[PDB]
Design a protein around this ligand. Structure first.
Ligand SMILES: [Mg+2]
Lengths: 84, 91, 199, 244, 209, 233, 266, 59
């Protein structure tokens, strides 16, 4: 079924959700802590992770949507309003 | 191995494009994912709890027409059949 | 009259269809006529349709459903991919007869995929080509499945897979193999079933 | 649609052919029928496609690198070649080689005379073109004039489609090494089409196809025909074809 | 006779800019085939001849784009037409002295330094005194040596530095700066590397209440 | 929107200005517009025939003109409720243009789905320049595609060489196959002959597809590894 | 011919610029050998070789796509009399009426250009600048393609009053006379406005109505016909159809201008 | 999983709504309001999908 809307004052998303890419540093840190929990602290089985962690957090410890713009730009064109 | 969600299985005998080897294809597949959707009258299944237990919830609540996708007439007939089945000691 | 010319016009030559432009099921054959433009017309957004196609489209091929809609746009996709599959099949040389001596809607023979006749040899500077070699990609661990020239085919081995298969795993598709396309028939659905063998 | 060009003095060409090379029924075979045949085939092979808007030279450059369009390329090549040849044997639109042409001959062919280079061209056409082909005197980007012999409908502009070697018969290791080097150079290109730059341009073109000599000369005697062609070139055109 | 608007773009928002862009486009369109390979007037200077207050920054960037495209045409194949149309929009080498010395001046904080660099064997005097005598801190000597170390030319030059003002660090770093500037003269090709080391940049920082 | 009055009467208002003296000089357009009047009716106009198929619009068949029993055996002796409703709207509704060729265009591409993969150019060259004799299928200035088949079918029908559209369509189909096989053999043999004389091609279609798949698959690998590492944490 | 080019020496090869000039020499002489192209559409030729109004057929209007109207779901029913039918979910414009209206509008343009009036070509869609500029330049007219400032006619003093004006003779030759500030400040109203996209240019149409300027427009299936003096039913969405109609009008204006100059030279 | 079942059967919502009595007219108007809001969200999502499509094609 198609649910057409009445003429709206606007076409806007209240809180557009964005692509929050996860920080690589935190993922590496979580993997290393999991490794230490399983294989013991200062284990040699994930020294690579430690190395990688050291390499990625070395300089910095931590290593917007456009929908509203296009919706406002295109609303009059696509809304299917009858002619004046 | 990798998670099966992150991979795409191209079926057999089907043509494809290079685009199909990409996360775009999987994402487009996710976004774009019977007996009553036919000439059959659902009111003839009021004595068949197995068939019309498919159109209810685990607790037994009839599913909205938005879910079942049936026509208005067949939604009404199915609801009538389910309620009658509940009344006659089945269901 | 204008009506006769409209019946003969190029827009009228494209058969009506409203199949979804974003189909996510199984593709056995083309569903939409590919529309092409010359560079000179593309520079001016001209495609022979009603409305100018947006300048974002740099490709010279598209498929479309509706010339105009209530949304004041043309429903189109800037894709002409199915021509490259067909041509790639023509490069393979493997052939697939109803092309020889009220209405039936079933696909006739090959549905225009190939018109090559069965028995012919490919002369080469080496000599007559005995068998057809083609690059391809093993897809998944399973007759295995291979992406070859825009078609999914069945792979059969001489004796068994090599160590690279299980060494790579689900990344096996990243590396290119060589295949011999044994044969190619087409089924009732319109799907081509090539049988190949890894080399 | 591709249409056969109108030639200067077409009435005289239909009445008495080309003096000293072709009779009327020979020039009709090579131009008024062969060029029509080729233009019709090109039209049928390119109509309803982008290539219909392009001249045959541009068509052959566009389709030179695409294996499946070879037939179109062949047509687009022969048409082009067939007008390069006819143009430089037409009586007019006493012409003599320019000083610049002879100077470049002396700087290319080991300080040889024009007649000696003509004899070399006769020899080259006699040997390296079995059956159909084209004979060219071409200028490379090095300002060097050299003799090029293409088989069938090879082009003088684009070296990967010169088709100067007959691989049906045995070839010398020198020719095989040449092919290997050209293949490597083709692979060296970064463009996705796989094309290369080639600034070679034809100065002289002679049609070694049976449509040119067979009626007036015979199965043999193509050397006589090529000699008549090279002794009776339209040197106004040939001189204009060299960059000043 | 008849009074008509002068430009074909008279009814546009900014007719002057459109007219000038039309002329530039006409030239860029006639000579489109020519291959390719610039002090253009400023935004205000273009506003005088174009829209004035009407002129927009995007319009000025379009003008610059057209002018750059025309200018970048290969100089050998340009003609009088392009150059004539483009002209409307156009807006002491150091050496050694008689004694072979490169003389340079550097400043840091309230310190100043004048250095005479001559080719030599890595000798240095500061105010007529040995380097270790004048500069007690090693890091000051390392600062003075750093530009010569950048170009690997410690041991190839004699330095006669003379400082005044400020304190040891300021004087050492003004000598460093002066040496770098002097060294550029002996081999200009090394300037970039010295500029990359940071020794040709005058340190602006000073005491600020 | 209301039918506007002031765009088509600029001459009358201008002449009132000129007669009163409010405007001194006559405009340059004045005499031109005076000599070329605008159309000022803006009416809806009925139509009585479908342009495409020749169906007459606005005729009612009377009971006298149906003197024979219908398919259910019943005579028509009085008008039905449809005949009694005024059908004036049909006279003004823009008629739907219909052509049998469209039914026959749909069939062809259902029978030959891979003919849809042959690119088509909808940019017309010049419809007036077309002089085709459809006694044969190949035409100078045209490609070989489904429209050739269908135009040949229509030609065969209008000359009554066949009575049934099915047989004419089948005949056209077989001619089309005859031409397509020749074209494909021409292409294959041209490539073979080219290779036999030292034509060195670069990337072919298969290698083109391989390289595009590789370009896509590199990005896919990177995304897969990143997602797996993220999932593990 | 080619100044400031330094040739190369005979010993050394061609340079890049020498190669460019060499292949130009090839291009102008031999690159076009082999066949002449006939009955093939070239987009630029609609602008530089538009036909005369008397030579236009229904077939050439149809090949330009002028007949392709808006979707039937966006129909403005006041355009009912212009429509030939519906086909593939859009309305088809009756090209016989398009041809009649186009000839009428072309004659209006020719008459206004022959009278020495000002002609303005308005089109604000993406790729319409080239055709508008060429129409203006061959009619000795004016054009806008960027944006129509509202009030350009009804508020001309505040908008167009600052731009310069010029006295010209019967032959359109600049006289270079000095104008008074009062003369420079006056409104200079177009004698004819032609708008290629009237649906997106209602401001201009209304100003022309108020300022009492006759107007021509391409009227699509969703456009109001009564808002213009001389409608032309046709497709306003295709650059080919728009450029075809515009080139026709521009050539009619050019013929009017040529006639004016001819009698002024006799 | 259990909590998903709870929300999928509206069990918490029904328990909250059964706490106090609501007059049948108020129930009817709340029902109309909720259905309208649902249909409005469906239409809004359709329009946003059209916006994304048109943006991708370049409109
Ligand atoms: Mg429109």
């Amino acid at each position: 079924p198609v649910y057409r809307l009445p003429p709206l004052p606007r076409l806007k998303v209240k809180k557009p959700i964005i692509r929050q890419e996860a920080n690589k540093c935190l993922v590496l840190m979580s993997n290393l802590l999991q490794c230490w929990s399983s294989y013991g602290h200062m284990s040699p089985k994930c020294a690579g992770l430690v190395t990688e962690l050291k390499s990625c957090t070395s300089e910095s410890a931590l290593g917007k949507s456009n929908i509203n713009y296009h919706a406002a730009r295109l609303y009059d064109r696509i809304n299917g309003k009858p002619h004046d | 191995k990798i998670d099966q969600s992150l991979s795409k299985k191209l079926p057999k005998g089907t043509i494809y494009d290079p685009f199909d080897f990409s996360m775009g294809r999987i994402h487009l597949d996710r976004k774009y994912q019977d007996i009553m959707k036919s000439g059959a009258n659902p009111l003839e299944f009021y004595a068949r709890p197995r068939i019309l237990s498919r159109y209810v919830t685990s607790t037994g609540r009839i599913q909205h027409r938005d879910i079942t996708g049936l026509s208005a007439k067949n939604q009404r007939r199915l609801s009538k059949a389910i309620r009658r089945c509940q009344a006659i000691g089945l269901m | 009259t204008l009506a006769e010319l409209l019946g003969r016009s190029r827009i009228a030559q494209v058969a009506n269809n409203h199949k979804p432009l974003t189909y996510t099921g199984k593709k056995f054959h083309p569903t939409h006529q590919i529309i092409e433009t010359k560079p000179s017309t593309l520079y001016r957004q001209e495609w022979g349709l009603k409305s100018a196609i947006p300048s974002k489209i740099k490709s010279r091929y598209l498929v479309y459903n509706d010339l105009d809609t209530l949304e004041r746009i043309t429903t189109f996709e800037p894709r002409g991919g199915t021509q490259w599959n067909r041509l790639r099949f023509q490069e393979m040389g493997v052939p697939i007869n109803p092309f020889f001596k009220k209405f039936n809607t079933e696909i006739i023979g090959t549905g225009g995929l190939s018109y090559s006749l069965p028995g012919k040899l490919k002369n080469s500077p080496n000599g007559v080509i005995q068998r057809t070699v083609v690059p391809g990609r093993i897809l998944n661990v399973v007759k295995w499945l291979a992406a070859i020239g825009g078609f999914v085919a069945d792979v059969v081995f001489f004796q068994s897979p090599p160590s690279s298969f299980n060494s790579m795993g689900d990344f096996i598709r990243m590396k290119t193999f060589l295949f011999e396309i044994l044969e190619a028939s087409m089924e009732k659905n319109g799907s081509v079933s090539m049988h190949a063998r890894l080399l | 649609i591709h249409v056969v060009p109108k030639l200067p003095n077409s009435k005289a060409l239909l009445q008495n052919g080309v003096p000293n090379i072709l009779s009327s029924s020979g020039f009709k075979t090579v131009w008024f029928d062969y060029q029509r045949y080729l233009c019709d085939k090109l039209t049928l092979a390119t109509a309803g496609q982008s290539l219909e808007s392009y001249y045959p030279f541009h068509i052959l450059l566009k389709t030179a690198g695409n294996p499946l369009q070879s037939n179109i390329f062949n047509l687009a090549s022969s048409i082009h070649n067939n007008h390069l040849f006819v143009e430089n044997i037409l009586p007019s639109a006493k012409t003599e080689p320019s000083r610049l042409f002879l100077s470049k001959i002396k700087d290319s062919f080991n300080g040889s005379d024009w007649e000696v280079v003509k004899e070399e061209m006769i020899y080259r056409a006699e040997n390296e073109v079995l059956g159909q082909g084209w004979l060219f005197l071409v200028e490379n980007n090095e300002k060097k004039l050299f003799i090029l012999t293409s088989n069938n409908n090879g082009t003088p502009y684009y070296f990967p489609r010169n088709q100067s070697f007959d691989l049906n018969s045995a070839i010398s290791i020198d020719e095989f090494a040449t092919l290997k080097q050209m293949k490597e150079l083709i692979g060296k290109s970064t463009k996705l089409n796989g094309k290369v730059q080639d600034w070679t341009m034809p100065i002289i073109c002679v049609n070694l196809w049976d449509h040119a000599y067979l009626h007036d000369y015979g199965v043999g005697n193509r050397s006589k025909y090529v000699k008549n062609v090279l002794d009776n070139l339209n040197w106004s055109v040939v001189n204009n074809r060299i960059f000043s | 006779r008849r009074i008509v608007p002068k430009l074909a773009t008279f009814y546009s928002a900014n007719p002057n800019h459109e007219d000038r862009i039309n002329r530039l486009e006409r030239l860029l369109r006639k000579y489109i085939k020519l291959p390719s390979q610039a002090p253009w007037i400023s935004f205000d200077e273009y506003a005088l001849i174009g829209g004035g207050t009407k002129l927009k920054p995007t319009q000025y960037t379009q003008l610059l784009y057209m002018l750059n495209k025309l200018h970048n045409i290969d100089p050998q194949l340009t003609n009088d037409e392009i150059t004539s149309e483009l002209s409307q929009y156009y807006k002491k080498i150091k050496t050694l002295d008689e004694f072979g010395r490169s003389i340079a001046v550097g400043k840091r904080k309230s310190s100043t330094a004048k250095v005479f660099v001559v080719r030599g064997t890595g000798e240095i005097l500061v105010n007529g005194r040995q380097l270790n005598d004048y500069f007690l801190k090693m890091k000051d000597r390392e600062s003075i040596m750093y530009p010569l170390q950048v170009i690997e030319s410690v041991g190839k030059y004699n330095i006669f530095a003379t400082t005044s003002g400020g304190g040891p660090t300021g004087q050492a770093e003004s000598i460093m700066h002066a040496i770098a500037k002097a060294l550029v003269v002996f081999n200009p090709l090394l300037k970039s590397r010295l500029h990359k080391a940071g020794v040709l940049t005058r340190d602006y920082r000073h005491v600020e209440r | 929107m209301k039918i506007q009055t002031n765009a088509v009467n600029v001459l009358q208002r201008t002449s009132a200005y000129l007669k009163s003296g409010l405007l001194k000089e006559t405009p340059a357009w004045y005499n031109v517009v005076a000599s070329i009047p605008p159309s000022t009716k803006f009416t809806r106009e009925p139509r009585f025939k479908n342009p495409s198929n020749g169906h007459i619009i606005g005729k009612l068949v009377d009971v006298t003109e149906q003197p024979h029993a219908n398919n259910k055996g019943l005579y028509k002796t009085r008008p039905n409720s449809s005949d009694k409703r005024v059908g004036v709207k049909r006279l003004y509704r823009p008629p739907k243009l219909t052509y049998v060729e469209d039914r026959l265009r749909s069939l062809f591409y259902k029978q030959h789905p891979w003919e849809l993969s042959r690119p088509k150019i909808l940019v017309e060259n010049e419809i007036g320049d077309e002089n085709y004799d459809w006694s044969h299928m190949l035409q100078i200035g045209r490609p070989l595609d489904g429209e050739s088949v269908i135009q040949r079918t229509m030609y065969l029908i209008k000359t009554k060489q066949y009575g049934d559209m099915v047989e004419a369509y089948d005949h056209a189909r077989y001619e089309f196959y005859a031409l397509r096989m020749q074209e494909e053999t021409e292409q294959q043999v041209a490539l073979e002959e080219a290779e036999m004389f030292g034509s060195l091609f670069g990337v072919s279609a298969i290698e083109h597809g391989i390289q595009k798949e590789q370009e896509v698959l590199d990005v896919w690998e990177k995304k897969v590894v990143e997602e797996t590492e993220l999932m593990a944490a | 011919p080619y100044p400031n080019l330094i040739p190369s020496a005979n010993d050394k090869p061609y340079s890049s610029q020498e190669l460019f000039l060499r292949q130009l020499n090839h291009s102008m002489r031999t690159a076009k050998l082999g066949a002449t192209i006939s009955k093939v559409y070239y987009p630029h030729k609609d602008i530089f070789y538009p036909p005369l109004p008397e030579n236009i057929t229904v077939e050439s209007l149809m090949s330009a796509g002028v007949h392709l109207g808006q979707s039937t779901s966006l129909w403005r029913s006041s355009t009912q009399s212009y429509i030939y039918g519906e086909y593939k979910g859009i309305h088809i414009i009756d090209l016989n009426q398009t041809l009649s209206y186009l000839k009428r509008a072309a004659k209006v343009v020719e008459g206004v250009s022959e009278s020495g009036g000002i002609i303005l070509f308005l089109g604000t869609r993406q790729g319409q600048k080239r055709g508008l500029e060429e129409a203006a330049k061959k009619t000795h007219g004016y054009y806008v393609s960027t944006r129509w400032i509202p009030g350009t006619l009804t508020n001309s003093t505040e908008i167009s009053g600052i731009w310069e004006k010029q006295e010209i003779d019967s032959n359109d030759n600049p006289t270079e006379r000095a104008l008074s500030p009062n003369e420079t400040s006056k409104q200079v109203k177009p004698d004819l406005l032609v708008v290629l996209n009237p649906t997106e240019n209602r401001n201009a149409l209304l100003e022309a109505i108020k300022s009492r300027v006759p107007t021509i427009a391409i009227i699509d299936t969703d456009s109001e016909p009564s808002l213009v003096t001389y409608p032309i039913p046709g497709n306003d969405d295709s650059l080919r159809s728009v450029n075809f109609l515009l080139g026709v009008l521009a050539r009619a204006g050019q013929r009017g201008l040529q006639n004016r100059l001819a009698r002024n030279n006799e | 999983r259990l909590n998903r079942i709870m929300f999928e059967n509206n069990i918490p919502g029904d328990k909250r709504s059964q706490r106090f009595y609501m007059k049948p007219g108020k129930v009817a108007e709340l029902k109309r309001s909720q259905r309208h809001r649902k249909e409005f969200m469906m239409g809004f999502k359709r329009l946003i999908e059209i916006v994304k499509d048109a943006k991708r094609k370049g409109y």
